[PDB]
RNA sequence: CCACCCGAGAUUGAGCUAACAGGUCUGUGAUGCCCUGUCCGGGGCUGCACGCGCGCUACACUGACUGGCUCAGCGUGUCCUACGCCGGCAGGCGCGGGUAACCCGUUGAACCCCAUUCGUGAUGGGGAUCGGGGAUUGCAAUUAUUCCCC
């Protein structure tokens, strides 16, 4: 009966699928029925254009109630339609991606090795310089992906930092104003909410430190 | 200098660093 | 260690940057003796000429310039291929050099070093 | 804005609402003057002896033709266009980008620069006026809409 509410979900009439949509979302969170579901969402999205932008919408909301490995090939399959570069597509899978670390999973959700394949990976992206559709979203990612990933394991949390903060640094040259208020915006509540609470385990640092302090002065 | 002038005097000289510093396929999977 | 300058003319900007090298000035990638209009090609030799073939030898220059026209573009060139130099001689050789440079490139024509502040009229209603 | 110290006093009493050169809405004067069109088709909208004014192209050698090389800026748009195929050209068919310091667009502009032919000849200067054909927008191209070839 799962699969035949699931199945119902790439219907082509939109009041069908919206009450699916709707009707998946309600029963899984209100979780055995969660690997199932997943293993349709990954076949769904190698079988096929019209038809991915519902099943992203579906993983959009989708991915908080997934476990490890399921996240671990949900998160190769989000980024295997980044290779190809529409636009319409990419702005939903980017958004997806903001719904998974928006809802801060605990540890059986989203274990802390898997934070550092991701951000590590969507270094490639970037998009030009200057477009401030998915720019805006995909600085907003990065945000949310290492905020979490600070709170999960804080000192490892330090050694992501300075390459994002690189990038953040860098992109301030971007001629669009709303490019410019979304990066301090980002790189203020960092500052604000990993680093603040735990200086005072970092203490006095010099130009010499080695291990976590050596990111702070890398963040100067 | 001014305004238009140097908006061109700067992105030209922007460029000619980046063309000295200058001088693959995206990861798919995540885990090895 | 570098020196990034810049010459302009009415609308022809350029940028220079130098550093050790063996003598050899490049233009968007072409020699000094390619570029386009050879009438004015001792415009482009006169920092060269004036100050001598030894006293380049020391420096790289490489050149990039836009906008502009065919010899708005020559008079950006020698602009900013003499003022490279006297940058270059300043902060890495004496002053008394840099000072020696100056003098005789300025009592041949003006224009080598200051720019020349002429540009286009808007017309109003 | 509120509370408070000092301070006689951090506000108590006498005068001022008013208006429509914008007008509107159909109520009145047996109010002052003075008289008793719609749809459809076709045409031309400068047809040209002349007087008076703008402009464009030229009368060539500091030039024309052919090839090659090499540089802009203000602006532009959901109408600007990229790319592929076909034709010799105007022009067709397909598929994308851009509501825009994001695409056109590193805005590959023209004089200019370098080679070739021409050689003072109403000439390879100058292009009017014409003949024949082709293509595009439009209900419609005749009195040549516009563009291309000889």
């Not at chain 1, 699931?6 to 699916?20: D, E």
């Not at chain 3, 000035?25 to 001598?52: A, D, F, H, S, W």
């Amino acid at each position: 009966v799962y699969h035949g509410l699931l199945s119902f979900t790439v219907h082509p009439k939109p009041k069908i699928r919206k009450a699916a949509q709707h009707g998946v979302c309600s029963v899984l969170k209100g979780h055995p029925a969660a690997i199932s579901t997943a293993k349709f969402c990954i076949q769904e999205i190698e079988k096929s254009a019209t038809t991915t932008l519902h099943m992203l919408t579906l993983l959009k909301d989708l991915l908080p109630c997934f476990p490890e490995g399921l996240v671990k090939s949900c998160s190769e399959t989000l980024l295997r339609v980044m290779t190809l570069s529409h636009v319409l597509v990419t702005a939903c899978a980017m958004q997806a991606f903001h719904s998974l670390f928006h809802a801060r999973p605990g540890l059986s959700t989203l274990s802390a090795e898997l934070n550092a394949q991701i951000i590590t990976a969507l270094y490639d992206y970037v998009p030009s310089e200057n477009d401030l559709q998915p720019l805006l979203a995909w600085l907003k990612v990065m945000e949310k992906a290492h905020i979490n990933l600070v709170r999960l394991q804080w000192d490892l949390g330090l050694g992501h930092l300075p390459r994002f903060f690189g990038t953040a640094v860098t992109c301030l040259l971007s001629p669009h104003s709303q490019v410019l208020t979304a990066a301090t915006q980002s790189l203020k509540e960092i500052l604000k909410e990993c680093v603040a609470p735990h200086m005072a385990d970092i203490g006095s640092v010099t130009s010499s430190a080695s291990g976590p302090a050596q990111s702070v002065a890398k963040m100067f | 200098v001014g305004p238009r002038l140097s908006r061109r005097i700067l992105q030209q000289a922007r460029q000619q660093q980046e063309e000295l510093e200058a001088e693959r396929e995206r990861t798919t999977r995540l885990g090895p | 260690q570098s020196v990034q300058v810049f010459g302009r003319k009415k609308t022809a900007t350029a940028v220079a940057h130098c550093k050790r090298g063996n003598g050899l000035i490049k233009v968007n990638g072409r020699p000094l003796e390619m570029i386009e209009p050879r009438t004015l090609q001792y415009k482009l030799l006169e920092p060269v000429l004036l100050l001598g073939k030894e006293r380049f030898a020391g420096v790289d220059i490489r050149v990039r310039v836009k906008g502009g026209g065919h010899v708005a573009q020559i008079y950006a060139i020698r602009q900013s291929i003499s003022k490279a130099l006297v940058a270059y001689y300043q902060k890495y050789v004496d002053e008394a050099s840099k000072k020696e440079i100056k003098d005789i490139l300025i009592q041949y024509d003006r224009t080598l070093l200051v720019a020349d502040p002429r540009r286009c009229e808007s017309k109003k209603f």
